[PDB]
Design a protein around this ligand. Structure first.
Ligand SMILES: [Mg+2]
Ligand SMILES: [Mg+2]
Ligand SMILES: [Mg+2]
Ligand SMILES: [Mg+2]
Ligand SMILES: [Mg+2]
Ligand SMILES: [Mg+2]
Ligand SMILES: [Mg+2]
Ligand SMILES: [Mg+2]
Ligand SMILES: [Mg+2]
Ligand SMILES: [Mg+2]
Ligand SMILES: [Mg+2]
Ligand SMILES: [Mg+2]
Ligand SMILES: [Mg+2]
Ligand SMILES: [Mg+2]
Ligand SMILES: [Mg+2]
Ligand SMILES: [Mg+2]
Ligand SMILES: [Mg+2]
Ligand SMILES: [Mg+2]
Ligand SMILES: [Mg+2]
Ligand SMILES: [Mg+2]
Ligand SMILES: [Mg+2]
Ligand SMILES: [Mg+2]
Ligand SMILES: [Mg+2]
Ligand SMILES: [Mg+2]
Ligand SMILES: [Mg+2]
Ligand SMILES: [Mg+2]
Ligand SMILES: [Mg+2]
Ligand SMILES: [Mg+2]
Ligand SMILES: [Mg+2]
Ligand SMILES: [Mg+2]
Ligand SMILES: [Mg+2]
Ligand SMILES: [Mg+2]
Ligand SMILES: [Mg+2]
Ligand SMILES: [Mg+2]
Ligand SMILES: [Mg+2]
Ligand SMILES: [Mg+2]
Ligand SMILES: [Mg+2]
Ligand SMILES: [Mg+2]
Ligand SMILES: [Mg+2]
Ligand SMILES: [Mg+2]
Ligand SMILES: [Mg+2]
Ligand SMILES: [Mg+2]
Ligand SMILES: [Mg+2]
Ligand SMILES: [Mg+2]
Ligand SMILES: [Mg+2]
Ligand SMILES: [Mg+2]
Ligand SMILES: [Mg+2]
Ligand SMILES: [Zn+2]
Lengths: 138, 234, 150, 208
RNA sequence: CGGUAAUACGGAGGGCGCGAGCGUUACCCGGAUUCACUGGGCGUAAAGGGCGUGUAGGCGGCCUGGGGCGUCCCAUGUGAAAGA
RNA sequence: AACCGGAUUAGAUACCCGGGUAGUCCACGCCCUAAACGAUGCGCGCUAGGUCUCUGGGUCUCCUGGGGGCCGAAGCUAACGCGU
C-alpha cells in the first residue's frame, strides 16, 4: 500500500521536475487536490486538472520551469527548487499560530492544514489559525 | 531562401541508437529506423536561419566545423563560399579555450609561408629545408580553414554535435552560441539553434549548408550563383 | 577596482625516484565589495606564480551576489561533498560572524553582517567551494516573483 | 589602576598617532614623527602579514588605548552596547564618548585624556552644580559640565581655556569659555567621531 | 622541542597580554551536527539481525456522514515574592 | 586431522612422497557458529535509455509481464563506484 500519499505526490512532482517533464500524474485525493490548488495559486505549477488513467482518477500537474540558460548546463533554473514533507505519519507536526514559520525569509511557503482549510503560512497567519504543517515549498 | 519538398532527401536516420532527448523531433519508427518529423525540422529551420541572417548582416564570424568523412569537402567549399573559417581535418583540443595558443600556430604558418616565398628557402641547409617543408605541409593541412579566425567566433556551425562534441563543449564554456545539424543520436539540449536531420547522407548536408551559406551572403547583398558543391554529390 | 585576499597556500609534494618534488597550491578570493566575488585556485612550482594563477582564475568564475543592505536575502545551506555551509542574514550592528574562509569570501563580496556555520568536513577548499555555490543560489524577491509570474 | 607609563610608544605600536600625550603629539616630537615603527629591538624589521585575529586584536587595542581604559570596563561597556537597542558599533562609541574624563578632554578642559582623568579624580569638575570625582561617570544629554570655582583661579585651567578661545567644539558639545561651563547636548554619531578605528573589527574580535 | 648556530630547555635584553591582581589544578557547559528532536549514520570507514514465520507495538488507499479524543482559535483563572 | 615412516632443510614439530585413525556416508537425537557476502533488512511509490539472456503471453521486424547480466540519463558517493 502507499504509505504517505502526500509525500508520494510531493515526490512525484519533485522527480518529475528534476527531468523537466511537462506533466505528471498523481492519484486523485481531495486533500491532494486542495494542495495543488495552493501550488497553482502561488505560481509553483502551471496548474493541474482531473483526468482518468485506465478508469482511475488522477491529477495531471503541469509544472513550470525558468529560462533555458547560458554556457554549459543550459538546463533551466527550477521554479520548485525545494519540496519537503514536514509532518509525516509516525511523527506529526502541528503548529500554533505563533509557531508558524517564515519560509525562506519570506520567498517560500509553508502549506498548513487548518481547521479552516488548507492555507499557506501567510493565509493561515492572517486568518489567525494554526494546524498541521504539511510541507515546505520554495 | 527556404524549401518545402525536401522530404525528398532528408527523411530520417540512425536506426535505434537514439538519444531519448531527441524524441521531440521524431515522427515514427519506419522499417526499424527513426524518421524525423518533417514539419518540426522547418520550424527549427526558421528559428535557426533568423539568427543566422541577423548575425550575418550584423557582420559576425561563424566557425563552420565538420570532420565527418561525409562532410569534409562540403564544409571546405561552403565555408569558402562564405567569408567564414572552417575546421576540416581534426578539431584540436583548445581551438576555442586555448585560442591564443592555437593562434600562435597560425603565426608560425604565416611566418613559414612568407619565408617560402622569399629567396631564403635555399639559404638554409637541405635538412632544415625538409623539416620546415613538413611544418608548412601539416600546418596547411589542419589550419587551412582555421586560418582567417582573427578573434573568437561570434557563432559556431557543427554538422554532428555528437562527434564534434569536443568543440561544442568549448563553445558552451565560452558562451558561443552553437548551431548544429543533429540527427537522432544527438542531445538537442546542448544545441542553441538546431536543425534536426541526418548527420550522414551527403545529399542532405549539401542542401542544408548550401542554403545556409546562401542566406549568409544574401544578408550582405552579394547574390551568388549555384554552389559549386553540387558536383560532390556523386 | 579589484581587491584580492588569500585563503591558503600548501606544499602538496609528489613522489619521484630520487626524492620528492612539490607543487604549490594557492586559494585566492577577488572581490569588489560591490556584490561581485570570484574564487581561484592555482598550482605552480613556486609560491608566487601559483598565487598569480589563483588570482587570474578568481577573475574568471565570477559571482553576482544580491546584497540587501550589506546582508543576504534569505538563509541557505549548501552541501559540497562532505562540507556543509550555513549562511543566515544578519541585522546591522552584527558583523561577519563566519569561519576564516567564508569570512574572507563574504567580506570581499561586500557582506558586512552575516551569520554562518561550517558543518561536516571543515576542509578549506570544500568550504570555499561550498560558500561560492551558496552565493550562486541566492535569489531576490524580484527573481522569485519573475520565476512564478508566467 | 589604569595604564601608567610611556605612552608615545603605543603611538608607535598601533601605527597611528595616539593623542594621549596631549600636546607634543602635535609638535614634531611625538616620536610618531621620524619614528613610525613599533617599539623594541625588532621594530625596524619587516613585519609579517598579520593573522585575521591579529587585525581585530590591534584594532581593539588601538581603540582601548585611545580612551585610556582597563580591559574590564572596556568589555563591560561593550556588552552593555550589545544588549542595548541600536547598532552595537556606534552605541559603544557613544558610550565611551560619554565618560566624564573623555568629555572633560573633549570640552578642551584638559590637554589630554590622562590629564582629564586626573582633573576629574581631584574633584575639579562640576556636573550640574555637583562635584564628581569619578572619571567613569556617565554624562547624560543636558548635563552641565563646569569647573569648580575653587579651581577656576588655578593657572592650569586658565592656561588651557586661554588656548580654547575661539577654538571650535564638537557638534554634540558646547561650552562657555569665561564662566568655564560646558554642556553635553546629545550623543555623538559615527560621523561625529574622527576615530581612526574600525568598529566592525572590534565587534568581530568579541564574536570569538 | 634538546644528540653543537635551539625564536620550544635555562638566563638576559626586548616584546605581547592582563593588572591588585596574574597564573595553575579540579569540576560544569561550549566548541561536539562526537547520542544528531532541532541535527548523524550502517556496500568497502564503527554499524543490516544467518534465514523465515509471526505475537505485542508502530504505521494505514479512495468517497460520504456523525462525533469532536489529538489538533487549532477566543475568553478566563493560575503561573507567589526575588531573580531574568 | 591426529599419528607412523621417507625426503627436503641450518633445523622441518611444514610445504613434497609412502601409509593411516577419527571423520567424510546412513538412521535418530544434539550442537546454532561462518568471508552464514550483494560484506548492501523488508514493503510500496517515482525517476532516460541501450544490450545479452531465462521463462510466460500476444495482433510474434516486434509488443507486453516475471527473473538473471552488462553499459549508462538524472541523481548520489570521500572516492571506488551505485545507477527501474
Ligand atoms: Mg589532433
Ligand atoms: Mg550519426
Ligand atoms: Mg568527385
Ligand atoms: Mg550534495
Ligand atoms: Mg554526506
Ligand atoms: Mg569530522
Ligand atoms: Mg541574482
Ligand atoms: Mg546592540
Ligand atoms: Mg548631537
Ligand atoms: Mg558568540
Ligand atoms: Mg656552544
Ligand atoms: Mg648555541
Ligand atoms: Mg641541530
Ligand atoms: Mg627563547
Ligand atoms: Mg613554549
Ligand atoms: Mg627560554
Ligand atoms: Mg623580560
Ligand atoms: Mg578592580
Ligand atoms: Mg583566579
Ligand atoms: Mg568538554
Ligand atoms: Mg550537542
Ligand atoms: Mg562519539
Ligand atoms: Mg564523545
Ligand atoms: Mg557520524
Ligand atoms: Mg578491513
Ligand atoms: Mg564494515
Ligand atoms: Mg543479509
Ligand atoms: Mg554481520
Ligand atoms: Mg487515512
Ligand atoms: Mg489505527
Ligand atoms: Mg467528518
Ligand atoms: Mg476538542
Ligand atoms: Mg493563560
Ligand atoms: Mg516574577
Ligand atoms: Mg614427516
Ligand atoms: Mg630428517
Ligand atoms: Mg633453510
Ligand atoms: Mg554462503
Ligand atoms: Mg537502511
Ligand atoms: Mg509479505
Ligand atoms: Mg536490463
Ligand atoms: Mg512468443
Ligand atoms: Mg531467484
Ligand atoms: Mg529485466
Ligand atoms: Mg553524472
Ligand atoms: Mg554500473
Ligand atoms: Mg516504473
Ligand atoms: Zn604621541
Amino acid at each position: 500500500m502507499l504509505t504517505d500519499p502526500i509525500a508520494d505526490m510531493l515526490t512525484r512532482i519533485r522527480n518529475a521536475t528534476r527531468v523537466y517533464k511537462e506533466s505528471t500524474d498523481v492519484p486523485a485525493s481531495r486533500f491532494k487536490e486542495e494542495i495543488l490548488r495552493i501550488l497553482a495559486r502561488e505560481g509553483f505549477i502551471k496548474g493541474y486538472e482531473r483526468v482518468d488513467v485506465d478508469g482511475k482518477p488522477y491529477l495531471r500537474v503541469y509544472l513550470k520551469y525558468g529560462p533555458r540558460r547560458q554556457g554549459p548546463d543550459p538546463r533551466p533554473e527550477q521554479v520548485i527548487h525545494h519540496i519537503r514533507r514536514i509532518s509525516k505519519p509516525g511523527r506529526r507536526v502541528y503548529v500554533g499560530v505563533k509557531e508558524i514559520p517564515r519560509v525562506r525569509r519570506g520567498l517560500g511557503i509553508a502549506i498548513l492544514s487548518t481547521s479552516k482549510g488548507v492555507l499557506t503560512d501567510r493565509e493561515a497567519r492572517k486568518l489567525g489559525v494554526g494546524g498541521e504543517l504539511i510541507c515546505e515549498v520554495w | 531562401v527556404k524549401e518545402l519538398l525536401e522530404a525528398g532527401v532528408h527523411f530520417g536516420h540512425e536506426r535505434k541508437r537514439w538519444n531519448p532527448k531527441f524524441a521531440r523531433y521524431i515522427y515514427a519508427e519506419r522499417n526499424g529506423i527513426h524518421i524525423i518529423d518533417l514539419q518540426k525540422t522547418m520550424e527549427e529551420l526558421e528559428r535557426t536561419f533568423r539568427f543566422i541572417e541577423d548575425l550575418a548582416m550584423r557582420g559576425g564570424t561563424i566557425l563552420f566545423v565538420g570532420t565527418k568523412k561525409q562532410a569534409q569537402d562540403i564544409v571546405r567549399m561552403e565555408a569558402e563560399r562564405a567569408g567564414m573559417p572552417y575546421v576540416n581535418q581534426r578539431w584540436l583540443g583548445g581551438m576555442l579555450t586555448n585560442f591564443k595558443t592555437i593562434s600562435q600556430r597560425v603565426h608560425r604558418l604565416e611566418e613559414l609561408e612568407a619565408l617560402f616565398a622569399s629567396p631564403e628557402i635555399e639559404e638554409r641547409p637541405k635538412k632544415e629545408q625538409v623539416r620546415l617543408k613538413h611544418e608548412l605541409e601539416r600546418l596547411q593541412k589542419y589550419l587551412s580553414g582555421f586560418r582567417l579566425l582573427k578573434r573568437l567566433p561570434d557563432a559556431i556551425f557543427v554538422v554532428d554535435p555528437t562527434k564534434e562534441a569536443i568543440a561544442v563543449r568549448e563553445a558552451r564554456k565560452l558562451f558561443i552560441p552553437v548551431i548544429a545539424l543533429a540527427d537522432t543520436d544527438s542531445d538537442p539540449d546542448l544545441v542553441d539553434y538546431i536543425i534536426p536531420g541526418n548527420d550522414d547522407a551527403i545529399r542532405s548536408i549539401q542542401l542544408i549548408l548550401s542554403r545556409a551559406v546562401d542566406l549568409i551572403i544574401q544578408a550582405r547583398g552579394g547574390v551568388v550563383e549555384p554552389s559549386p558543391s553540387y558536383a560532390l554529390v556523386q | 577596482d579589484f581587491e584580492e585576499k588569500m585563503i591558503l597556500i600548501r606544499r602538496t609534494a609528489r613522489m619521484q625516484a630520487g626524492g620528492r618534488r612539490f607543487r604549490f597550491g594557492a586559494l585566492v578570493v577577488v572581490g569588489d565589495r560591490q556584490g561581485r566575488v570570484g574564487l581561484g585556485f592555482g598550482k605552480a612550482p613556486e609560491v608566487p606564480l601559483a598565487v598569480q594563477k589563483a588570482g587570474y582564475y578568481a577573475r574568471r568564475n565570477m559571482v553576482e551576489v544580491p546584497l540587501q543592505n550589506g546582508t543576504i536575502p534569505h538563509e541557505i545551506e549548501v552541501e559540497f561533498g562532505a562540507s556543509k555551509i550555513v549562511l543566515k542574514p544578519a541585522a546591522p550592528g552584527t558583523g561577519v560572524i563566519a569561519g576564516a574562509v567564508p569570512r574572507a569570501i563574504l567580506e570581499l563580496a561586500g557582506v558586512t553582517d552575516i551569520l554562518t556555520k561550517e558543518l561536516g568536513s571543515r576542509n578549506p577548499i570544500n568550504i570555499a567551494y561550498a560558500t561560492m555555490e551558496a552565493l550562486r543560489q541566492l535569489r531576490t524577491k524580484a527573481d522569485v516573483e519573475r520565476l512564478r509570474k508566467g | 589602576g589604569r595604564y601608567i607609563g610611556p605612552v608615545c610608544r603605543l603611538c608607535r605600536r598601533e601605527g597611528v598617532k595616539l593623542y594621549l600625550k596631549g600636546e607634543r603629539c602635535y609638535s614634531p616630537k611625538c616620536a610618531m614623527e621620524r619614528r613610525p615603527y613599533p617599539p623594541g629591538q625588532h621594530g625596524q624589521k619587516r613585519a609579517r602579514r598579520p593573522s585575521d585575529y591579529a587585525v581585530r586584536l590591534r584594532e581593539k587595542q588601538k581603540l582601548r588605548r585611545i580612551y585610556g581604559i582597563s580591559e574590564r570596563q572596556f568589555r563591560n561597556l561593550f556588552e552593555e552596547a550589545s544588549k542595548k537597542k541600536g547598532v552595537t558599533g556606534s552605541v559603544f562609541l557613544g558610550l565611551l564618548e560619554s565618560r566624564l574624563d573623555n568629555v572633560v578632554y573633549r570640552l578642551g578642559f584638559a590637554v589630554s585624556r590622562r590629564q582629564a582623568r586626573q582633573l576629574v579624580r581631584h574633584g575639579h569638575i562640576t556636573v550640574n552644580g555637583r562635584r564628581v570625582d569619578l572619571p567613569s561617570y556617565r554624562v547624560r544629554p543636558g548635563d552641565e559640565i563646569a569647573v569648580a570655582e575653587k579651581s577656576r583661579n588655578l593657572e592650569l585651567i586658565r592656561q588651557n581655556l586661554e588656548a580654547m578661545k575661539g577654538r571650535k567644539v564638537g557638534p554634540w558639545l558646547s561650552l562657555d569659555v569665561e564662566g568655564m561651563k560646558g554642556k553635553f547636548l546629545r550623543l555623538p554619531d559615527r560621523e561625529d567621531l574622527a576615530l581612526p578605528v574600525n568598529e566592525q573589527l572590534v565587534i568581530e574580535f568579541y564574536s570569538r
